[PDB]
Amino acid sequence: SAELKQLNQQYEKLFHKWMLQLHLGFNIVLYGLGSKRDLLERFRTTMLQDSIHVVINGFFPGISVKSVLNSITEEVLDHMGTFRSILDQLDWIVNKFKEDSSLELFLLIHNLDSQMLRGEKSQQIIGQLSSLHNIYLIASIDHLNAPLMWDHAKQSLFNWLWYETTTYSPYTEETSYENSLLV
C-alpha cells in the first residue's frame, strides 16, 4: 500500500515540464503497468486544474468520437454540437480557434484504444486536433498493438513524447467496465 504514492509523486515533477512540452507542440504519453487515474486525475487536480480540460475515458464505451467532439464542443467549448461532417466541424471550431488565438485546451484520454477511437477517421480527427496547437493531448495506452495503429502520418500528426510511466495502480474504474465469464 505504501510504495505507489511516491511514484505517483515523482511523475508530478515532470508535470510542469510537460506543460512546457505542451507549449512546444508535443503531447505526452504514459505506458504503465497500472492505472494513472490517481495520477491523471491528480494531473487534473494538480497540473491541468485551471479550465478547458476535456476528459473522455476510452474504457468508457459511452463517449464517442462524434460525442467526443460534441462533448468538447457542447459544454466546455460551448460553441455548438459539432456539425455533421467532422471535417466541417473542425473547420468551424478552428475558424473560431485560428481566429481566436492563445486558447490552450488540455485533453486527457484514458485508453485511446477504444472503440470508438479505432476509426482511422477518429485518429484523423485526434490527429488534426492534437496537430492543431491550441489544444494538447495526454493519452494513456494499454494495448500492445496501440503503437500498431499509429502510422507515419499519425505519429507525425501526433508528436508523441513517450514516458516510462510504469504505473502499479489498478485498473478499478477501468476494470469496472470489463465483464468476464465467471459471472
Added chain:
Amino acid sequence: KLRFETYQLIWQQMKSENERLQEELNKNLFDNLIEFLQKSHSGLREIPTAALVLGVNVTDHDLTFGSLTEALQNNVTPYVVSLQAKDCPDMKHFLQKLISQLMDCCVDIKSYMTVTQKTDPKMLSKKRTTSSQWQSPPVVVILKDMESFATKVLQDFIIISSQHLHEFPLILIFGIATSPIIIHRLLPHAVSSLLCIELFQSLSCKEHLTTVLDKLLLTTQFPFKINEKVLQVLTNIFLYHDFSVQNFIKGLQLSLLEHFYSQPLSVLCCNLPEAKRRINFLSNNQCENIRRLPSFRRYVEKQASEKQVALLTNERYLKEETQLLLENLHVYHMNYFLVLRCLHKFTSSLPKYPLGRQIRELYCTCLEKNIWDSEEYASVLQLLRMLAKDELMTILEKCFKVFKSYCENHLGSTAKRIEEFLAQFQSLDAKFEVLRENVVNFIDCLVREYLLPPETQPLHEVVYFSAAHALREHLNAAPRIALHTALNNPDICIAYKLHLECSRLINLVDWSEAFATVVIIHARFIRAVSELELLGFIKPTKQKTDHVARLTW
C-alpha cells in the same frame, strides 16, 4: 529562459538554412525542372511529363510544391496545378480540380460553394482567358503521388487528357521515391510512351542527413554538442528506423531543450563574451555547481593549494579560472572541426572505410573511443602508407586547395598550427613526408587536435549532452521493453509467468483448474488476463472454448 531565446535563435536559424538549402538542392534540380521544362518547351495526343524521384519523405517537400505553385507561377511561364492521388478516387475530381486549379492558378497572385466545377473550364482558360497567348503555358500538373493514383482512373486520365492534347501541352510532375520500373508498372506501357518522360532525380533523406550533420550539428557556430549515446541512439533512430530529417530534427530540438533543462551550468554555453557576461551574472549557488561536476573535479584533481579554494571558496579566482576553462574549451572545439574536415578529405577518399565514410561517421567513431586505441584506424594507417604516390598527392593537394579553402573561407583560424601544416604541404607539391604529415596528422592532429570527448577540457558536460536514455523513452517509444521486462520481472508477475508456462492453448476448465493446481485468488488472473487483452499479451480467443491466447510473440 535564456536557453529558449537561444532555442528560437538556433532553431529557426536551423530550419531557415534547412529550408534555404532545401531551396538550393532544389535550385540545381528546379533550375533543371524549368530548364528541362524549358528544354521541351524549347523542343499530338501525347502528354509529355516530368518524373521526379523524391525518396520516401512526405511533408518536408510539400514546401517545394508550394514553391512550384509559386516558382512556376513566377517565370510568367505556366499556371501550375497539383492533383493528389488520394484526393482522387473517381474520374470526376481530377478534371474538377484540373480546372478549379487553373482558374485558381490565375487568382492567388492578384494580392460558389465548391461543388460547381467540372471538366470544361481548363479547356477554356487557355482558350477563353488566353487562347492566343501566343506561347502556350505549360500547366505542369503536379501529380504529387502518381503511385497511389487509381489505375483505372490513371489510364482514363492519361487517355482522356492524352486524347484531348496539344490544345493542352500538359506536362505533369511526379512526386516519387523509387526507380523507373515501378512507374512502368502502375503506369502501363501505352502510358510510359504517352508520358514521353525524361527521368529526373530528387535528393533523398540520407543525403540531407549527412549534409546537415556535417553542416549544422557539427558547426562551430552553436556550442551545443551531443554525447556518444544520444548521437548513436539518434542516428540509430534515423538510420535503423525512420528516415525523416523531420523526426531527427524534432528529436534534435527535444535533445536541445532536453539538455537545456539539465542545470543552469549551460548559461555559460554561449560565445566567450556572451558566456562571460553570464560569468559576471554568476552567483554562489552556481559557484557550488561548478565546484561539483567532473572534468572540473578532474580539473580540480590535477590542482594545487589555496588557488584551489578560491575555486572552492572564494569565487573570484574561479570565475577567472572559468574564463580559463571555457576560453580554452571553445578554443579546443574549433581546433577539432578545422581538423575533422581535414581528416575527411584524407580518409573519405580512402577505401575499406573501416573507421568511417561520411563526416558524421568520423565524428562518431573518433569521439566514441580512442582512434589510436582502435585497430581499424591503424589499418587506415597501413593503407595511407600503401597508396603513397600521386593518388595521395592529388587528394592531399585537394586537402589543401579544399582545406586551405576552409581556413581561407570556411574557418577563420589562424590557429598557427594550420598554417605550419599548410606550408609543409605547399613544400611537398613543389613518403616519410607523407608519414610525417600523417604523423603530423597523428601526433600533431589525431593525438593532439582530434581528441576524444572525455579526454578534453574541463566542463565537457552541458556543452556535450549525456542522459540518452530518457529521450529514447520519450521518442524511440519502447513500451514493450518496459512491459516485457516488467511483467516478467507479484500476482500479475506470476500470472505472466503462467501465461508463459502452460503450453500453447490452455483450457479454462484445466486453465482455471491448472491455475488452481499451480495457483480472491482467481479475480486477479482474470484482471491480469483482461488487461493482457487490453494490454494485448493475450486475446479473448475462440480457437477453443473459453480460451485466452496471445497474438504477441
